[PDB]
Amino acid sequence: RGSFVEMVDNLRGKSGQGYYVEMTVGSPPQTLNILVDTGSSNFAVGAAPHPFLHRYYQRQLSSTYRDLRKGVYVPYTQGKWEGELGTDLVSIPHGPNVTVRANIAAITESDKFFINGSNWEGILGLAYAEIARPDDSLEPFFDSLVKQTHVPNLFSLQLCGASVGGSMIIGGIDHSLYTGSLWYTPIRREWYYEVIIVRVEINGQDLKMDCKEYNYDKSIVDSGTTNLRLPKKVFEAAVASIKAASSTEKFPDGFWLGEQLVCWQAGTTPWNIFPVISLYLMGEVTNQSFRITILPQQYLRPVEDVQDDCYKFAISQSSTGTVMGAVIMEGFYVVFDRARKRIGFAVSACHVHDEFRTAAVEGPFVTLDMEDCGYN
Ligand SMILES: C[C@@]1(c2cc(NC(=O)c3ccc(C#N)cn3)ccc2F)CCOC(N)=N1
Ligand code: NA
Numbered sequence: 001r002g003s004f005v006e007m008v009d010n011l012r013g014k015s016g017q018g019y020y021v022e023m024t025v026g027s028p029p030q031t032l033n034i035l036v037d038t039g040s041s042n043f044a045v046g047a048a049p050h051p052f053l054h055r056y057y058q059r060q061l062s063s064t065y066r067d068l069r070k071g072v073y074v075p076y077t078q079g080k081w082e083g084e085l086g087t088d089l090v091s092i093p094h095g096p097n098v099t100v101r102a103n104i105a106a107i108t109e110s111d112k113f114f115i116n117g118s119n120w121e122g123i124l125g126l127a128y129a130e131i132a133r134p135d136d137s138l139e140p141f142f143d144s145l146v147k148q149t150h151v152p153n154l155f156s157l158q159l160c161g162a163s164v165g166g167s168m169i170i171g172g173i174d175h176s177l178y179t180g181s182l183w184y185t186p187i188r189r190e191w192y193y194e195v196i197i198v199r200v201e202i203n204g205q206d207l208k209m210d211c212k213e214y215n216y217d218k219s220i221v222d223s224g225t226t227n228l229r230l231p232k233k234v235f236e237a238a239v240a241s242i243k244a245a246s247s248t249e250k251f252p253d254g255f256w257l258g259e260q261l262v263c264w265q266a267g268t269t270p271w272n273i274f275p276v277i278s279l280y281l282m283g284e285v286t287n288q289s290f291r292i293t294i295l296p297q298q299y300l301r302p303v304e305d306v307q308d309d310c311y312k313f314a315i316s317q318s319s320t321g322t323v324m325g326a327v328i329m330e331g332f333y334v335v336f337d338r339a340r341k342r343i344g345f346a347v348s349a350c351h352v353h354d355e356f357r358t359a360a361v362e363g364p365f366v367t368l369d370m371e372d373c374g375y376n
């Protein structure tokens, strides 16, 4: 409880490529780097010599592998994977000192899935059974962990943005990782980590949309997506406020659609011209909310593959609802308190800020009719 020094700093990554944790699978153990993803529910690992992979799971080496004799085919918007299901012993070296028999999907064919040049070779789907493929009787990793050990039913994430690293605390919260207080929002349904956004401000000016728009058709917290994604109508209104608040300079409008990069001379990006963005989330108590505030440092992402200082606009339009991706999460320490069905936010002790502004988590606020904000 409250102090897990062996787990601090157990995540790594590179800009644009996500945050991964070291895992071992099988007997004797095979070490793999595995992307941490709160937006999906399968533990799936490269199991064949795909040319982009540093390492892959070799079932034939594991004396503890058991075949489930069932294939899985998983298409996404961008690309797909398919593989073969089994179970094996899994452990997290910089994690609790336990071993668990978990489901693993051994990926034997994929397309647009692995990143050329990245250092991970599998994905740890940390969300619930309801979105597991092929169906909800395939128990997710973290459910197996809790069922089989005395690890408490919660984990927390601190993602430190730009090389990147962070911490995933399995079984607890580490208080040195955040400042001020944790504020909690209810998990509305256990499938994704679905939450309810009740109001949206751009430099403290309310968007004034019906709040049901903010959650059309859901809002989720997703470490496996880079951007803040917003439902289309909300995106349209948010950009229009961001441009106004910022029209102290004039950028190519393709910039706002994420279609072109913008660059300044190294040394001073003018952060001060860009507004803060606040999301009010449903609180624990009737008619009570709290608000989280992110900076341009979070939503303007450095792009490194080209001489000066180039950024991509990292808020984008969505058709799958609001996605609070690594753009939101890098401001906060986020607690996935599955035992009490709630998600905690606090200011991260590592978030990227300047001398004038920081990220913020503040409450309570009085917000009426917060249940009307959910979409059915
Ligand atoms: C399973 C699925 C997925 C996710 C990923 N993520 C990343 O590459 C990735 C890249 C950068 C960041 C950051 N900062 C986080 N994730 C790759 C394939 C992939 F299939 C589907 C889409 O959405 C979710 N969350 N997970
Ligand atoms: Na348990």
Ligand code: NA
Pocket (backbone or CB within 6 Å): 175, 176, 177, 178, 179, 180
């Ligand atoms: Na603290």
